[PDB]
Write a protein that binds this DNA or RNA. Structure first.
Ligand SMILES: [Zn+2]
Length: 254
DNA sequence: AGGTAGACTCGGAC
DNA sequence: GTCCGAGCTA
């Protein structure tokens, strides 16, 4: 799930778990648990705590309990569901939180790629994976000025810059390529080569692209290689940039 | 020094 | 066999 989906999850999941008290925690793929590194300590500390809230930071979900916060990343295929403890688990279910009312919060992930970290609430924001996370792309904290400062101080490509979680929180590959197409900037351009207007435009397209998705095939380049650009008809091309599949129109983007 | 490329994980798809 | 990709180590 990308950031917009994660926000949808935060919004829809919260009412389904708020005020519920954890009675048990079951872990079927320990590698998901990153802190405490010992999945036994992770499970034990959460028992007896009541879910008080659910927040989002980038693509991380932050479950707020009585004393602790649980920080979760779903990567590409992770998903949460609330269901009855009486029903069989779905395939690829790796972590289950059991509530005192007979319902369960279940985490599924065919790729087993997601992560979970638990800390005292007051520490969560100053430990991984949240520590050093950059500003929310839809917050005033992420401004053109902030982007410009990071761009001028690096040799990397502009795509690499946007992919950096310390620059902006949870801005996914699809949104990077779409934002760059919409801003008319080739992904392989050196970040420091971007003019003031280009940074202004890129920031604007970033906020609009991810903002529009948060509010909600309407894609210009991502996954469209070999197909005509929707704006100029030039075949969309795909190469590797910053170690990622990168889609662009060689005519629209400069 | 500290920014940077690299390595690393998973399994569905070729 | 090789490909893919989000966010500790030289
Ligand atoms: Zn085009």
């Amino acid at each position: 799930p990308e950031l917009p989906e994660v926000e949808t999850i935060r919004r829809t999941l919260l009412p389904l778990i708020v005020g519920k008290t954890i009675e048990d925690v079951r872990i079927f793929w320990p590698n998901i648990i990153r802190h405490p590194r010992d999945s036994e300590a992770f499970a034990a500390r959460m028992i007896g705590q009541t879910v008080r809230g659910l927040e989002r930071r980038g693509k991380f979900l932050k479950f707020l309990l009585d004393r602790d916060a649980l920080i979760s990343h779903l990567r590409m295929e992770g998903r949460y569901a609330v269901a009855s403890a009486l029903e069989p688990l779905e395939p690829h279910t790796h972590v289950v939180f059991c509530f005192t009312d007979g319902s369960e919060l279940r985490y599924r992930d065919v790729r087993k790629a997601g992560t979970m970290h638990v800390y005292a609430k007051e520490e969560a924001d100053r430990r991984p994976p949240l520590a050093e996370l950059g500003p929310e792309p839809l917050s005033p904290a992420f401004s053109p000025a902030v982007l410009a400062e990071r761009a001028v101080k690096t040799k990397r490509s502009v795509k690499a810059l946007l992919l950096d979680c310390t620059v902006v929180a949870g801005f996914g590959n699809i949104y990077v390529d779409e934002s760059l197409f919409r801003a008319g900037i080739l992904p392989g351009r050196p970040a420091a080569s971007l003019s003031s207007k280009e940074i202004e435009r890129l920031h604007e397209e970033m906020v609009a692209t991810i903002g529009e998705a948060v509010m909600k095939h309407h894609l210009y380049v991502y996954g469209r290689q070999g197909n005509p650009c929707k704006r100029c008809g030039t075949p969309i091309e795909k190469t590797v940039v910053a170690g990622r599949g990168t889609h662009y129109c060689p005519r629209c983007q400069r």
